[PDB]
Amino acid sequence: GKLTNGALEASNVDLSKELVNMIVAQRNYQSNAQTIKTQDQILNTLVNL
Amino acid sequence: VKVAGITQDFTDGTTTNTGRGLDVAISQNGFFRLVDSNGSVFYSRNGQFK
Amino acid sequence: MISSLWIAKTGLDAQQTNMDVIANNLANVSTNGFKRQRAVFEDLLYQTIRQPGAQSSEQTTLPSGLQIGTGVRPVATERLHSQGNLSQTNNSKDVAIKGQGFFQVMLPDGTSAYTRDGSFQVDQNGQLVTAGGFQVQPAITIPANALSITIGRDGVVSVTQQGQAAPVQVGQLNLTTFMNDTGLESIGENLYIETQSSGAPNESTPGLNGAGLLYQGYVETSNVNVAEELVNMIQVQRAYEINSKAVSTTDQMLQKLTQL
Amino acid sequence: MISSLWIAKTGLDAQQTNMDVIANNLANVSTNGFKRQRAVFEDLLYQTIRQPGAQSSEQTTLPSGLQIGTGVRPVATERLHSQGNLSQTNNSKDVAIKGQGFFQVMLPDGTSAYTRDGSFQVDQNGQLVTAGGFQVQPAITIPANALSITIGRDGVVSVTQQGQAAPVQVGQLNLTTFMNDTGLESIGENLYIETQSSGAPNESTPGLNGAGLLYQGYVETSNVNVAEELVNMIQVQRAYEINSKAVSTTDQMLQKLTQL
After folding, report:
1. Which of C66, D47, D156, D163 has a CA 20 to 30 Å removed from the CA of D181?
2. How far apart are CA D176 and CA D92, in angstroms?
3. CB spacing of A36 vs D245 below 8 angstroms
4. Chain A residue with minimal CA distance to D243?
5. Residue D175 β-bridge partners
6. CB atoms A31 and C226 under 8 Å
7. Hey, which family's this protein in (chain A)?
8. Cβ D249 vs Cβ D188: under 8 Å
9. SS3 content of chain D, % helix, strand, coil (to 5)
10. Contact indicator for D115, D190 with CB cutoff of 8 Å
11. Which of A2, A5, A9, A18 to mutate to test the interface with B (most CBs of B within 10 A)?
């Protein structure tokens, strides 16, 4: 590529995409925590026999 | 699940005028070549030079 | 040691398998080109005792005899092959399939696996490879002096060199389709290998007799639905707890008998 | 007093050790330059009974004989020497490590200890000391009328004096590297001492050889990941309850024996 003098190459991070990805990742993490909690309430129920 | 890897989106970003003569922007492909105090070779897209 | 204990010991194991399937589906909610699993169950033995339909008298038959049954067993976990939603992540090296075909990839041992993941990279030698470093087939090399990579809807890979107004074709991407997509054996790393229940690998071009279409800059996400998995967890948890209660009731019954 | 009771007692002790490791990891979240611990277990001895592979007849061997095993024992507690997150405190005296080196300090016993903590102070004598007052070899004396301290990426310490246009070098901070980093014996107060399994201390400047670089104004936070510890705590609690249930079952069987 060619060099442009007097200019800087800024970052390529789009904030809207990052925010929506953060939201969906939070929901997925909560779902995984929920199934973790279910496996225990199952192990605890088996223990209380 | 297993994390196969972490990539880096090597697409050209914004070009912003700065008004200083020592900043260079690389459109399209290319990497600036640097050497540290040890002598290793490095590559960087940041054109903020001094 | 007693019949109801074995039956409720099979119920526990089947519900644990269902929970395992649900948890595995929820863990891979973000992996591209994923197909979620579904466990199927079937009845175990049925002890005959009094035979159903047995001739009690010389003219009267016994309807629906004493058929005491055994627990449950799972046949298998089948992959729900549906089209995951496509995502526009705008990179020239990501390709997504629109139909029901598979990419062919050559394993290091010389055999060929089949993957629907479209996140492709370029190795140091210039070949298209899967993100796990497995080289794609039938080999699409990419020159060092490449300016843009264009993969069309027909799988044709073109590379535009510097200062040249015409693109250069560097290969042709083909899709493999099977009689039975479920019977493929998953070997991990988003890879499936051929099994005799999956028929034979039929190679086809993308748009003809049944291979899917390829879209560049798109990634095929998983078909896992979170809400349905949540509801299924709530129902599997209740079923497991109730079967454990059956175990406990059998245990209490055996206690009094022994005490006698 | 019975074999299963000893096995369950060993399991309980191992799970308690795991819980202590988790608690120690949790207690040192705010410590700087702390490396989390992980415990590794091994399975104990085996009562032989019938030997596996013993010749039963003149030609037929016995496959997989009665190997009744004993409980479990923890072998080791290993540190995870990984680069923790760097935190900017904007202090002229705080130093952070970027690689895999160690700072060398002198205990008042006369032996040398090694610490990765970088929160340094100056004593009333003007020397560089650790927050516990241990003097930081190979020894940096800071003059009385200092205006600012500059510690370079390679370890050169300079002091800017009033009326002098040039900085004055007052020492050189060095890093010690070990061939085996996990073999160091932790004596507390963020100090590790060398053992015979920790190789020999190789002193080097930050940048040369393999030692890491020094960042001024930064502190190395602990590498403890908390959510993993919470999940491990849940697992440890459930496993401890299961082992306690095994103990209870053994106790009940012994009780039903006595009355006979």
Report:
1. D156
2. 22
3. no
4. A47
5. D204
6. yes
7. Belongs to the flagella basal body rod proteins family.
8. no
9. 25, 30, 45
10. yes
11. A9
Q: For residue A7, list chain B residues with Cβ-Cβ distance below 8 A.
A: 15-18, 23-25
Cβ-Cβ contacts under 8 Å between A and D: the total is: 11
> Which tokens in the block code for residue B30?
């290319």
A40:D245 CB<8 A: no
Amino acid at C85: N
3 state SS of C25: helix
**Percentages (nearest 5) of helix, strand, coil residues in chain B:** 0, 30, 70
Q: Which two tokens stand for residue C40?
A: 């199927």
Rounded Cα distance between D260 and D256, Å, is 7
Residues of chain A whose C-beta is under 8 A from some C-beta in D? Answer: 36, 40, 43-44, 47
CA–CA distance, C129 with C113 (Å, rounded to integer): 13
Using DSSP, how many helices (H) and how many strands (E) does chain A show?
1, 2
Contact yes or no for B16 and A6 at CB 8 A: no
Contact B5 C91 (CB under 8 A): no
Asked if residues C127 and C121 have their Cβ atoms less than 8 Å apart, the reply is no
Given CA atoms C30, C31, C35, C36 in this order, what sign does their dihedral have? negative
State the structure-solving technique.
cryo-EM
Tokens matching residue C182: 């479920």
